[PDB]
Amino acid sequence: TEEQIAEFKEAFSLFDKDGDGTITTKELGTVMRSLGQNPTEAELQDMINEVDADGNGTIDFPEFLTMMARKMKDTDSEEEIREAFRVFDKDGNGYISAAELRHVMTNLGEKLTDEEVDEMIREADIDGDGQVNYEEFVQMMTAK
Amino acid sequence: TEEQIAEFKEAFSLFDKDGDGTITTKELGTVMRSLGQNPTEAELQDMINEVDADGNGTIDFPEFLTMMARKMKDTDSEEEIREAFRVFDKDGNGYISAAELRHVMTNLGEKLTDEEVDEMIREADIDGDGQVNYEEFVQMMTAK
Amino acid sequence: TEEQIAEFKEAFSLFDKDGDGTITTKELGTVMRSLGQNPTEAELQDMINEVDADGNGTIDFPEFLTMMARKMKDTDSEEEIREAFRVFDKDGNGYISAAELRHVMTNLGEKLTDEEVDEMIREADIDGDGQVNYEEFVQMMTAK
Amino acid sequence: TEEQIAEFKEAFSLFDKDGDGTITTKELGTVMRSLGQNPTEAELQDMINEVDADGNGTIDFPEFLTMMARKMKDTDSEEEIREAFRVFDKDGNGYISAAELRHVMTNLGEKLTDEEVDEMIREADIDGDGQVNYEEFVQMMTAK
Amino acid sequence: THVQGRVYNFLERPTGWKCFVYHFAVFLIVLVCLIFSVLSTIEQYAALATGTLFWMEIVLVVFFGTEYVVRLWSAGCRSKYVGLWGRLRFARKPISIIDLIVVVASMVVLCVGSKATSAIRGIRFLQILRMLHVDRQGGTWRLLGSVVFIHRQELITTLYIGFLGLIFSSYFVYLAEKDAVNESGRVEFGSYADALWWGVVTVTTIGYGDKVPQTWVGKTIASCFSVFAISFFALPAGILGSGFALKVQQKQRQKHFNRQIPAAASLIQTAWRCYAAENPLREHHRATIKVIRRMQYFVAKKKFQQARKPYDVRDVIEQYSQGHLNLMVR
Amino acid sequence: THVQGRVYNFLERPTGWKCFVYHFAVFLIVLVCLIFSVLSTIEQYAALATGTLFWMEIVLVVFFGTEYVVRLWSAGCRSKYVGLWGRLRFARKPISIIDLIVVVASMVVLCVGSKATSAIRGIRFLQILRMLHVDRQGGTWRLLGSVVFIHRQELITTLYIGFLGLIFSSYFVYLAEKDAVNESGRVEFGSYADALWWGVVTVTTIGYGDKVPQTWVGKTIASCFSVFAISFFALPAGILGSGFALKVQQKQRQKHFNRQIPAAASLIQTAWRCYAAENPLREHHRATIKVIRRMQYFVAKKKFQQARKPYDVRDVIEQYSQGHLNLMVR
Amino acid sequence: THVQGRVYNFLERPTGWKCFVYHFAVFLIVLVCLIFSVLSTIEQYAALATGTLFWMEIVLVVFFGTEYVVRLWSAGCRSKYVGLWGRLRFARKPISIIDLIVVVASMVVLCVGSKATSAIRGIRFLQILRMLHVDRQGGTWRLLGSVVFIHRQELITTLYIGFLGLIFSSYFVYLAEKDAVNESGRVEFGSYADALWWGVVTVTTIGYGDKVPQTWVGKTIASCFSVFAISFFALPAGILGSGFALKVQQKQRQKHFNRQIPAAASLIQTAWRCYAAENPLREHHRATIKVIRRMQYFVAKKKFQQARKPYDVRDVIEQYSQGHLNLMVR
Amino acid sequence: THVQGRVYNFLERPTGWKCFVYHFAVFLIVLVCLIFSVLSTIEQYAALATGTLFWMEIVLVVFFGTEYVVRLWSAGCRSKYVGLWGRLRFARKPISIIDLIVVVASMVVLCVGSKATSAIRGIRFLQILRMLHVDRQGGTWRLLGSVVFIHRQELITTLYIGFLGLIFSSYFVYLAEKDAVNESGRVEFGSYADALWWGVVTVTTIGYGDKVPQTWVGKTIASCFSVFAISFFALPAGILGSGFALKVQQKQRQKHFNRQIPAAASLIQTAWRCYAAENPLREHHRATIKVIRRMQYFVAKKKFQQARKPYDVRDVIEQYSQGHLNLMVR
Ligand SMILES: COc1ccc(-c2csc(NC(=O)[C@H]3CCCCN3S(=O)(=O)c3ccc(C)cc3)n2)cc1
Ligand SMILES: COc1ccc(-c2csc(NC(=O)[C@H]3CCCCN3S(=O)(=O)c3ccc(C)cc3)n2)cc1
Ligand SMILES: COc1ccc(-c2csc(NC(=O)[C@H]3CCCCN3S(=O)(=O)c3ccc(C)cc3)n2)cc1
Ligand SMILES: COc1ccc(-c2csc(NC(=O)[C@H]3CCCCN3S(=O)(=O)c3ccc(C)cc3)n2)cc1
Ligand SMILES: [K+]
Ligand SMILES: [K+]
Ligand SMILES: [K+]
Ligand SMILES: [K+]
User: Fold this and answer.
1) How far is the CA of G144 from the centre of ligand 5 (A)?
2) What effect is documented for mutating residue 106 to F (chains E, F, G, H)?
3) G-E interface (Cβ pairs under 8 Å ≥ 3)
4) Which domain holds residue D27?
5) Directed axis angle between helix E235-275 and helix C98-105, to 10°?
6) Helix (H) or strand (E) holding G231
7) Annotation-wise, does A37 bind a ligand?
8) What residues contact residue H237 under an 8 Å CB cut-off, 6+ apart?
9) Which ligand is located closest to the Cα atom of residue G206?
10) Longest distance between any two alpha carbons in chain C, whole Å
11) What structural domains and CATH numbers belong to chain F?
């Protein structure tokens, strides 16, 4: 862990375009707009209204080190993510086919690149049937 | 078991005052009235409306051997009897004292002889406190 | 398994009376009417509106190999079938007698041949009592 | 245990200011008022309306030995006390910070001395984060 | 003789659209014959009406006579009523005896009366008494009676209380208004009976206006009363409505389970078959019977499962309580 | 002296069919005596009535006097009232004191009045005041009072609001209609009191019609009012009805459990016996007592089980929550 | 051509405050044009009104014509209606055809009538028929119809019963009051039709007072009736109210879950991204895209969780039933 | 200055019996002053009344002036209002400004008017406007407004529908009855406005009787209408009643938990003490403080447990769902 706690702080202030310990919330909207995102101001604000536990707007990784310090793979995030499929559960069994799954991954919320969605289920449709078992995908993402 | 399946049949027809394979429902009311019970006719009838699975009124131990062939000690009769205390549960803990227990055993339903109630809880009040633990009584009656 | 995946396809098109990969939904009503069934057209249609996962009406065992490829004996079909007795559960215990069981097997839905119903419970009434234990029948049918 | 069952009885009647086996309910209000409490009469009365299982007002440790004879550390008092935090549960996790915890310990019911509240959580904020894990405090109080 | 029960339930246990419009049509016929009994009492039109009510009456009486006899014959499908004694057990029932006396008394009146006052004086009541003929089985009245019997206590209560309020407040009013004379010179409250009429008309929110008090005392009391008692003659509405609704729901629920059973039966009745695929081109007949057994089974399984779903909350909790129990074994 | 409590609960805690028709009969007697008090105020019939109301009155007074004394004597079965002091604690209660003053004042009037205006003027109020005598224990009124106290806030609220609406809209109407003169030449709205009478009669949906506005302003206001305020004088009905129903259900529920207990007791009271079959042709007496102990036990078990079933949803969840807890031990 | 659907849902699926006050304003315009149709029938004011209702009418007709055409054009955003055939499938619907005939018939009347009785005689009905134009989509009527169809049985029941009560009690009254003559010399109950009018007016608690009975028999019956039948004409209120409420709740519930889905989708749609942070100063662009992926994920997780909370009881029990099941696997 | 908030909540957050009868008494004073404003408009009594309403008025104005000033001073206990700016933030609120203008305008009228028409013409409206002064905090109105806003859709719906029914049926009636002439020679339906008055009076079950139709068409329509539309002006009652009740329950529930918290806090606040019995005849002081710590703890435990019991069903299920979860960890 000690091998990234340092090179991470450099990118930490990389948003402020300076050496201030400032996440640069008003300037992250330009950082991303230059990355190719161009979000709205409400989304920009909600990005940090909770990602940063401090509450200021520019922080010295009180949580910018905590967000990174959250494996995002433990059991606390394997059930919350498994319930989302259960929204799409019907007759259970992790039945989902590539058909409904592509229908959905490319229509709702934050859609993917057609090449992203096509090869995303590719690793989860190894058997080639129309049942993309969830346990097959989380095990793939369990290292998140 | 084979040592009682025979001497039991003799008493079986002992109610009919004859050798007929008849429980003698109309005559059990006199058998008991002579024993010192003298029940009513509705109670006499309900005694057999379910004790005798046949449904006639006089039977060749279709159930008069089944009623005897029911240990009355297994787990199927240890919870139904434990729930009755739970009716008298309040703050749980099998708290019941000899006080409430005597209050009740001698006031409701089919009361006992004062000597029956006094020495009934005697075996269940070994510690002499006012908490007649149920687990202390069923273990005593588990051989029922 | 590979010993039946071939001789099964021959009977597969045996409904079309030809070599087309067609279940012959309109002709299965004649296949069975010749077998001695003579069903209605709505039943004929519902037979395949779900048995054939494809949805056409004549299929190259997309599911005509899946229906056969369903052991019909696993735990997924041992509880759904055990609940049906629980419909006829009353005081529990798998109490059912040959009496009510014959009463029912020959009166509701798709009744049997009297010789079918008589010898069906025969294997499940080994003890000869009026309690056809369900666990006694599923174990008999667990190889379904 | 036998090493305190005797020196405890001496303090037992220490409330009556005499040798009577009397808890001195009317005089405990002066005992405490001299200790520096000065409670009200309703609180004085409720102190013993349940602490003393007898019901008189002055007792020969029927329960004044039982209250002492209650470890106040077993599992029967580790969940009732853990639920109180669950009142202050929100998003779970024993999240409570020293912030809300001090906010509360010094505002509600029977507040502490600021030095009592400050060093009370001290032992429970060993990691110095804003999450005073309850399991960290009960283990500290499990010897109660 | 399969037609017997066929026409029976076409007549007596109707369901669908055909038998529906049948009953509906006969209802409309009845209703217009009534609405001519209406225009019979009007002298402008008491001539043509009483005329056509001599032809239309005969039409209906014969219509009903045949419908009745045929119904009776077709009451054999139900064993309870088969055989002369059963048949008699049939006409013993209320709606049937009603239709009977309707038809026969129409025949009476038209057998003697045709050779006109008493005639029409009775015919009107028959045309009125017939409407019973539509509700062929009485679910209406049974719904009602049940809901009542359930809520008997509430109803009696509010009745008793309203009754008393009526009584007392009316007596007081009588005392306060018995002298007073209307501006038209007359007196409205001469007796307690009149006051009591007032009370009825008032507490139930009709207010014709034929009797109104003049004195400050009477108005005072009537106000307080009118505010604090009317409500006891308006509860029954809410009660009965809720009762009706609840009961209908309760019933259709039960119906859900009565649907549940057959599938449970058919499932196994098909399982044992497909499973028992060895002891019912003979071998090809055997293969095909086996295949259909299998398919049907696959069908049932799904249909059962779909017909075992949680109508409501009690159902889920029973199910999973029961799972918990199953653990209690484990 | 077992009869004491026997007649008591025949009189004071009635249940069944005999005591029922008794109370019912006496009720009908009371009601007809009233309906003659009715026809007393009618001059056509004020002669025969006031006559027979001198015999029937004596009948009833003596009837009640005896029923009362016997009830009082039979109030010993209840220890609370045994002994002179308890007895006095009895007649201290409302319904009893009511019956007392009824009977004694009838006796008064008939001890002096017989030797006629004041007499009948009081007799009517007695015949009216007696109806209380039927509800022998007051469950009616208690139901009511409870339901109210529960819903006190809603009721006060709607009352306050309706009151205000009344006030304001009536003042405005008065202002708008005080000059106007009816086509019959007179004036309906001379004062605010009249307007306020209008308002009462209106907002509660009676509408006698004795006071109606003429001007466009008055009609405008009355319309808006009539639409937006009547509802606050019609809520109480729905409220109270729901309350009644709910409470009755709540009660009979509780009754379910009060039934539950005795069986729980008898079960064990029989178990210990059959089990304890060794320490109460003497040996045959012993055998038979043992057999009956066993049978009875077998009976209880079933009766308890059937009397422990889930009246409702809360019951099931409590039960299986408790099973879960039992696991929490395991 | 993004504006197409924009103005569409500004007109046809309105939500917010702008489109709101638009619809509201047009409503008020309609309402005042009506209230001038009102004052048109009054001779005092039938001159100026019928005048300005020749200008205001033209204003509205052109207004609506354009609003209609523009709506129709903007009905393409919805594919179902794109293309001439779809467009026709649009005007095929009720509210649209209503607006159409309104506008065109106003144009007719004002194309011929301007060169005055039949004109205004039709214009009034148009000004009345227009109010439909506000409820742009019909949720009102659909709510109603659903609630009814659900409760069809209760309603039919109470209707049938009240109808009968009406019939019978009215006949009896007719018999009891047909001779009687009002003190004003006339006769109220000449026929059964009059009695039946009485009944209607009575059982539904209006009580005009134009027909009142005089005889003791009639008053007796009317009392009993008035007490025991009015309730069957007042249930529908409670029923329908409860139905409305329930249904609205049911709907907004469903809406909760329809909200639930998108978050479930976005969560994973962000997870796969942040996780898949290796295969979409280029490297710094990569770092930043990764950081935002991570943040967004952290956002979703919370938003989902908050949007999966137990609206109600059934939800919790389903959830934890399901946990139990998950154990049933374990 | 502890008295400040003391009198405050004696005046502004009243609870108990003293402050209760205070508010009650002042209410009765207000009400009688009103009922003299009543008898003021009656010429028989317009002299003495208008007199004593010159003394009683001054009494009340000074009474209220002081009560107001003292309330205002005692509004400091609440920090939000401490300091002149806060104080101003106080009188900014509705009920306070109402009391203000009442009192000052009474002072105005009695500063100029005493040296009589306009005076009393205003005084009446003040005596009326004052009743607001009792509901010191507005829970009444807030209850109302909430319940409405919740059910806004149902209400709007039934309003729209009833409105239309009114409109159409009234137009048709106008067409059918405009010629007809009452037997008293006059004409009831000259315009659509009159018909519309009829409709209002009818559909809401008042029925004054001033306008009744004569023709068979009008009676027909009025009947159908009267049956099928009145219900849409009587739903609001049931709705609002249910809403009120529900909301009160919801609130007192919440109150249960707000009670729950303090005990949870005190329990631990005592546990840490008794446990921490070593670091706060000095040693005997220590012993006694320890003993009382222990006792108190024993008290809390029980009080908490009793104050954590299942108010309702959702509570139990949450609890045991949570136990299940705890297993999900285990
Ligand atoms: C608008 O806001 C309202 C309106 C009404 C209520 C409400 C609750 S309980 C109730 N009446 C009642 O509880 C009963 C009993 C008390 C007097 C008023 N009524 S009595 O006239 O029938 C009546 C009168 C006289 C006698 C001898 C028996 C019965 N009235 C509450 C709030
Ligand atoms: C047919 O569809 C309908 C019918 C009615 C409603 C409905 C909801 S709340 C409501 N009235 C009310 O909320 C109250 C308060 C606002 C004015 C109307 N009423 S007031 O006259 O008593 C009244 C008038 C004046 C004063 C000083 C106090 C009280 N009326 C909703 C839908
Ligand atoms: C104030 O306390 C009350 C008031 C009313 C009730 C109550 C329950 S059920 C009920 N009526 C009824 O059940 C029906 C049926 C029985 C007679 C009274 N009505 S009928 O006139 O429509 C009527 C009359 C004649 C015919 C041929 C058909 C229908 N009335 C209970 C308590
Ligand atoms: C006694 O048993 C009954 C009594 C009534 C019902 C019942 C359900 S829905 C209903 N009315 C209604 O649904 C509405 C709508 C259909 C016609 C009757 N009313 S309208 O007059 O307001 C009315 C009239 C004309 C216009 C243009 C709009 C609105 N009436 C059910 C059972
Ligand atoms: K009226
Ligand atoms: K009314
Ligand atoms: K009237
Ligand atoms: K009315």
Assistant:
1) 29
2) In LQT1; uncertain significance
3) yes
4) 6-69
5) 90
6) none
7) no
8) F231, F234, F235, F237, F238, G237
9) 8
10) 55
11) 3-137 (1.20.120), 142-233 (1.10.287.70), 246-329 (no CATH)
